[PDB]
Amino acid sequence: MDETVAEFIKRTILKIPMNELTTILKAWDFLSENQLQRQRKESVVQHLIHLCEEKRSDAALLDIIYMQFHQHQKMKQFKNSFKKVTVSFRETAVWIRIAWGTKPNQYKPTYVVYYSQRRNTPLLGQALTIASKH
Amino acid sequence: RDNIQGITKPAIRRLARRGGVKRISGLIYEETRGVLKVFLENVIRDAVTYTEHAKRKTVTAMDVVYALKRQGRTLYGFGG
Amino acid sequence: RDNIQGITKPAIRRLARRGGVKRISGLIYEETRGVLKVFLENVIRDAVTYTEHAKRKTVTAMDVVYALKRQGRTLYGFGG
Amino acid sequence: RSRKESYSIYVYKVLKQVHPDTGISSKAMGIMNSFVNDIFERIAGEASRLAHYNKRSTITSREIQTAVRLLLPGELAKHAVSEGTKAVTKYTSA
Amino acid sequence: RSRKESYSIYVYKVLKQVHPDTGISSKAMGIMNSFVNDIFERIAGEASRLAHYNKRSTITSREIQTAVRLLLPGELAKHAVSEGTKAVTKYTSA
Amino acid sequence: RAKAKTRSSRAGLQFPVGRVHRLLRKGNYSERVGAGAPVYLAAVLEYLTAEILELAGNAARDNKKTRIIPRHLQLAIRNDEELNKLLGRVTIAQGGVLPNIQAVLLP
Amino acid sequence: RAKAKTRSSRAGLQFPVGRVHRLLRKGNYSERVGAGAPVYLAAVLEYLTAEILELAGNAARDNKKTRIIPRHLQLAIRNDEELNKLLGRVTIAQGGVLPNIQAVLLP
Amino acid sequence: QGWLKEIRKLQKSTHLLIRKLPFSRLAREICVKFTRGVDFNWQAQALLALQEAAEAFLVHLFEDAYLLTLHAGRVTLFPKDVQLARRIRGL
Amino acid sequence: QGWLKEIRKLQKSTHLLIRKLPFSRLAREICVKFTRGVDFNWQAQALLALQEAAEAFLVHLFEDAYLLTLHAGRVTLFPKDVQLARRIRGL
DNA sequence: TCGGATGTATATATCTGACACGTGCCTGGAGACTAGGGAGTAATCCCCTTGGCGGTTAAAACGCGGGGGACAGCGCGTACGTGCGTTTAAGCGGTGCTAGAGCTGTCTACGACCAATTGAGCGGCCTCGGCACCGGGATTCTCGA
DNA sequence: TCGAGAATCCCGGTGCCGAGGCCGCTCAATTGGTCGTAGACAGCTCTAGCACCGCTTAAACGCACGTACGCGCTGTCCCCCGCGTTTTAACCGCCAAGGGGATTACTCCCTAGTCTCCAGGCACGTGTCAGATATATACATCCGA
């Protein structure tokens, strides 16, 4: 589980480019600020994952920022009600991301649909367009 | 609704008829699923290690043969 | 006056008592000499090949271990 | 652009040479491709050790002649020990 | 004169370190001498293949890790990789 | 400035010398490779392939087929004794087994 | 012009780095040998020897002896499960066997 | 009666016996319990490698086991006949 | 009566059982039937390698064989128990 | 226990999907030569195997007589194979999609090589002492009632 | 059960030889410095693989089945075990001789290495036919009736 949390964490850090590794990893604040204490990309994940033992659904929110720095590969209780990962919102430019759709499978491609105003595709459109009063 | 129960009773019997087995007791269907499950866990463990060494997310046929190579059961017919 | 009859009946029994064998039939003493004679012919054949490769006339301990290495029964304790 | 290779032509040449009108399936080439590589690996792998065992650094004809002397059951080996010896003298002629 | 090497002085340190009082016979060092070579054979002999398998011609620390992952059974391997990973970090510490 | 004469042709064999001689260096078996080695080796490889196909064709011939199926290899190896002593560890995909009814199951 | 500091000492290990690094080139395993390889390898070798001697001493301790005989190695490996899965093919000279009376031979 | 026909029929042919789609769901589920469970794609050629190697293991296993049935004066096979044959093989 | 004493005595110790001088005459005679029969010298350390490897093979052989004796409802071992155990091992 | 129905078999038919064979090409084997280093050959030093006796002493062969096992045979009782009507999920195609496999192209960190430069490590050398073995001897032992 | 029963194990002997430790020493390990290059790394891209749904139909599930089949059964009895005594040879030491394993200095021939041509192989391409499954008409074998 925490292994499977680390496996989503290890693959996410490896997927980002090292020309912008320190930029987007600082935007997640998954670790703390000054704790980033540069040489080898494969070795940097080997220390940061052991550095992820401090702060320990806990780490997928960094990937929703990773879709902002890579956007070419594709109340607000109107999504968490569909609990039959889960939804992982993030504030924004007045909208949010989802990174939601999964049994538990959060390392597969979850859907991404903002709102600026597989088989799960058949019902994820139903819970959205809830048409509340906002 | 279990995958290990996806190995039916006649399919197990189909294996033993090829092995020259006349008559099979009823407790075999639990043991044979147990033997098969261990035999895959000594291969899929080894096959995924090659799959994660060359940094990929897909097992190849050469990955299985390499796992069966060190296992000591060489399988021809696929090769490089 | 035969060397294969240099393996006495109690000496064969001494092996089987170490193997946890209670009671031994009488026809074993012919079979065990047969099994032992084949097991040496799959080793002394291989051990003398190393002995004749490095052009010598004397088998060493490393010659036997190399023969047992490819045979698939590694024997420690002697080494290099 | 994916310029790979195998022993596909050479098996078919040997099969045609000793059998006039006998064909082979493409699945059975995958046998013979996997067959000859496993024999090649076990022979060269074993004869690699005899150089290291006897401290020399040079795989020559003599190691293979004692590698095939070991890797086969002996009756099949009696022709194989003489087949290459028939051939290796022929190469040094021309 | 000749000169022959072993691992015996290094092992006698280890035995003294895990037990400050336990001694060992002469024959059991020959057990351990043949033991550690055979482990050194099968690890490097496997790790040489992965360089051949994935076409890079440089055995690094990573290829030893996956070979130890293959050779040792699943429970004993988990410590030795951690004992391995602890070693290289202290090596890169200075 | 002569014509390129193949060492395999000069050996009078069928298996490629020059491919084996390239593979035997790059397979990292030793440091130095003798000239007489990968010309002695190809004949050993040629004698084995000529052995098992000669049994494979007879499996094809007796089963009324001019095309060798992979099962005919399996029937060739297990019917031989000495090749079975070579290949008893190795299995064959799409091979099947011998038609082996065990003895005392009969009226 | 500094003092010769041992890489094994710099690793804080016990098994010799410099001997392994010499053997791993001359054993003809690959062409290029990484620096981090024979410092990762010696710790793996150190963890195994520290494993089996720690069982060997307990065989020595229980049999009232401060000197490890080779039989104590044999009793250590076969009483372990996982080492027996490693060394089940390998025998031991002057080892003997387990004290294994099979079950139903008793009054 | 028929079973002897069944033995000679299956020892005649060489096609696979375990059906592929349940066998595929089994192997993918075992792969989840390694590599911390992300998933892995499978070449369709590569899943046939297991389904060859699984049946060739088991068919060779029962022939070693069924000898022990006849050695025990029995004809009907038993799980005792299985685990003992696995034990003497040494793996 | 005594045989159970005999088993615990021999499984206690670890010394060799086959006497060396008949075992030496056996191995030298087999070596004559190879290399066209000249002779070969033997290191005295090297003949102990066989006498270890022969007994360790056979003692391991009977433990695999004696399981088949108890599996057959028997206690007394038989040559049928030997050759079958050799057959399932595969060598 | 013959009819006989149930299994066997060339024959044919088409249909097809694999495959044998033509072709362009292009990367790799070959030719020819160069140096230098392995390693073969030759000569030698003593190490260790070989082949003697004596003779000793446990080992082993002979032979029995005991009973414990093997085993043939037979009781029931039971679990599995065969049919068979009833689910059902595998398969196949089939379409839509894409995530990853793999390939190509720069940058550089990282190993190889080389040459000095010590000390850790290897054979002697010796001295202690742990295991080894004898029997007292203090426990802890087995079937006549 | 009882009892004496040898039997079991423990313990305090001499004592040996052998690991444990210390000693000259060398050579291989490490240090210092130089190079290229493998390989790391990021980036396109099109192949292969997952998903899904439909329709399937062959496959499986249950079950009633009787009918074989495990097996405990007891009696029989040939065939190991144990013991005991009388041959037999393995064994230790000892010795003596010596082929034969290791080492050493030797020269050169084989083999890497280079670089410079060319063509045998590879991928790719359509013809077509073995063969396979198709359906028969036809020829033999014994299953319950």
Cβ pair A69, A22 in contact under 8 A: no
| CA separation, residue G16 to residues A10, A41, E82, G8, I69 (Å) | 34, 30, 19, 6, 50
The letter for the amino acid at E55 is K
Between CA D61 and CA F40 the distance in angstroms is 6
- The residues with which F33 forms a beta bridge, in sequence order, are D59
- What phi and psi values does residue F90 have, to the nearest 5 degrees? -85, 130
d(CA F21, CA F7): 11
* Residue pair I57/C73 in contact by the 8 Å Cβ criterion: yes
- Whole-number Å distance, CA E75 to C1' J94? 46
Q: How many Å apart are CA G52 and CA E33, to the nearest integer?
A: 13
Please state, in angstroms and rounded to a whole number, the distance separating the CA atoms of residues I59 and C17: 9
Optimal mutation site among D34, D36, D41, interface B, most CBs of chain B within 10 A:
D34
With CA atoms as reference, the chain I residue closest to C72 would be: I91
CA distance F29 to chain E (A): 11
Q: Which two tokens stand for residue A56?
A: 């320990």
**Superfamily name with CATH number, domain G1-107:** Histone, subunit A (1.10.20.10)
Contact I40, C59 (CB under 8 A): yes
| 3-state SS class at G60 | helix
Residue where a domain stops, chosen among A39, A55, A74: A74
D85 touches chain G (CB under 8 A): no
* Count of the separate structural domains present in chain B: 1
Helices I20-32 and C44-53, axial angle in degrees (round to 10) = 70
Q: Would you list the domain boundaries of chain F?
A: 1-107
- Tokens at residue F59, please? 């499996």
Identify the helix (H) or strand (E) that includes residue I34: none
* G98 interface with C at CB cutoff 8 Å: no
**Tokens 């720095």 sit on residue:** A69
Task: Tell me the HSE value of D42 on the side-chain side, using a 13 A CA sphere.
Answer: 18
Q: How many domains does chain A have?
A: 2
- Cα–Cα distance measured from residue A125 to residue E83, given in angstroms and rounded to the nearest whole number: 51
Q: State the Cα torsion F67-F68-F70-F72 to the nearest 10°.
A: 130
What's the rounded Cα separation, in Å, for the pair B76 and I70?
39
Q: CA H26, H31, H37, H39 torsion: positive or negative?
A: negative
Task: Reduce the DSSP state of residue G32 to 3 states and report it.
Answer: strand
Q: If 0-12 CB within 10 Å is exposed, 13-18 middle and 19+ buried, where does residue B7 land?
A: buried
H25 phi and psi angles, rounded to 5 deg: -70, -25
Distance between CA atoms of D10 and D29, rounded to whole angstroms?
Answer: 11
SS3 letters for A11-66? Answer: HHHHHCCHHHHHHHHHHHCCCCCCCCCCCCHHHHHHHHHHHCCCCCCCCCHHHHHH
Which chains pack against G, by 3+ Cβ pairs within 8 A? C, D, E, F, I
Cα→Cα distances A47→A6, A10, A58, E32, Å: 12, 11, 19, 36
Identify the residues numbered 32 to 71 in chain A whose C-beta atom is closer than 7 Å to any atom of strand J. Answer: 39-40
State whether H56 and F74 contact (CB < 8 Å).
no
Q: In H13-90, where do the E strands start and end?
A: 41-42
Determine if strand J comes within 7 Å of the CB of C10.
Answer: yes
Pairing of strands E58-59, G32-33: parallel
**What is the SS3 assignment for G68?**
strand
The protein residue nearest J70 (Cα–C1') is I74
Q: In which domain, by residue range, is D27 found?
A: 1-94
For the CA atoms of I33, I38, I44, I48, what is the dihedral angle to 10 degrees?
-10
Resolution in A: 3.9
Domain containing A64 equals 1-74
| CATH number for the domain harbouring residue B73 | 1.10.20.10
Whether residue G33 contacts residue E24, with contact meaning beta carbons closer than 8 Å, is answered with: no
Residue F50 near residue D5 (C-beta atoms within 8 A): no
Show which of A74, A103, A126 is a domain's final residue: A74
E56 Rama class: left (phi>0) / alpha (psi -120 to 50) / beta: beta
- B36, H55 contact by CB (below 8 A): no
Residue pair H55/A22 in contact (Cβ under 8 Å)? The answer is no
> C20: which residues sit within 8 A by CB, 6+ positions away?
G100, G101, G102, I7, I11, I62, I63, I66
How buried is residue A89: exposed, middle or buried, by Cβ count under 10 Å (0-12/13-18/19+)? middle
Closest CA to G34 of G58, G17, G9, G53: G17
State the fold for domain H1-91: Histone, subunit A (1.10.20)
A95 and A115: one domain? yes
Token match 């620096």: residue? Answer: G35
| Contact between C70 and D53 (Cβ < 8 Å) | no
Helix (H) or strand (E) holding G14: none
Strand partners, D58: F32
Q: Which residues contact A76 (CB under 8 A, 6 or more apart)?
A: A89, A96
- D70/C70 Cβ within 8 A: yes
**What SS3 class is residue G44?**
helix
Report the domain count for chain D.
1
Q: Could you tell me the residue ranges of all domains in chain H?
A: 1-91
What is the residue range of C24's domain? 1-80
Q: For the residues of G69-88, what is the DSSP string, one character each?
A: -HHHHHHHHHHSSHHHHHHS
The alpha carbon of D18 is separated from its chain's Cα centroid by a whole number of angstroms, namely 17
Give the sign of the dihedral formed by CA I50, CA I53, CA I56, CA I58. Answer: negative
I21 CA to J54 C1' in angstroms comes to: 17
Cα dihedral sign for D39, D45, D48, D49? negative
I70 near C CB under 8 A: no
Q: How many helices (H) and strands (E) does chain D have?
A: 4, 2
Which residues are paired to E59 by β-bridges? G33
Question: G28 vs chain F: nearest CA distance in angstroms?
Answer: 6
Q: Is residue H2 left, alpha or beta, with left meaning phi > 0 and alpha meaning psi from -120 to 50?
A: left
Method underlying the structure = cryo-EM
Mark G10-38 as b/e (b = at least 16 C-beta within 10 Å). ebebbbbbeebbebbeeebbbeeebebbb
Find and list the nucleotides of strand K having atoms within 7 Å of a protein beta carbon: 8, 18-20, 27-32, 38-43, 48-53, 59-61, 69-71, 79-83, 89-91, 99-104, 110-112, 118-124, 130-132, 144
Tokens 């490897």, residue located: I53
D20: DSSP letter? T
Angle at G86 between CA G80 and CA G92, to 5 degrees: 80
3-state secondary structure of A80: coil
Residue to substitute from H33, H38, H39, H40, interface A, most A β-carbons within 10 A: H38
Ramachandran angles phi, psi of H50, nearest 5°: -70, -45
CA atoms within 13 Å, Cβ hemisphere of E31: 25
- What long-range pairs does A107-111 form, CB within 8 A, spacing at least 24? A107/A4, A107/A7, A107/A8, A107/A11, A107/H37, A107/H38, A107/H39, A108/H39, A110/A85
Quick one: A53 and A116 in the same domain? no
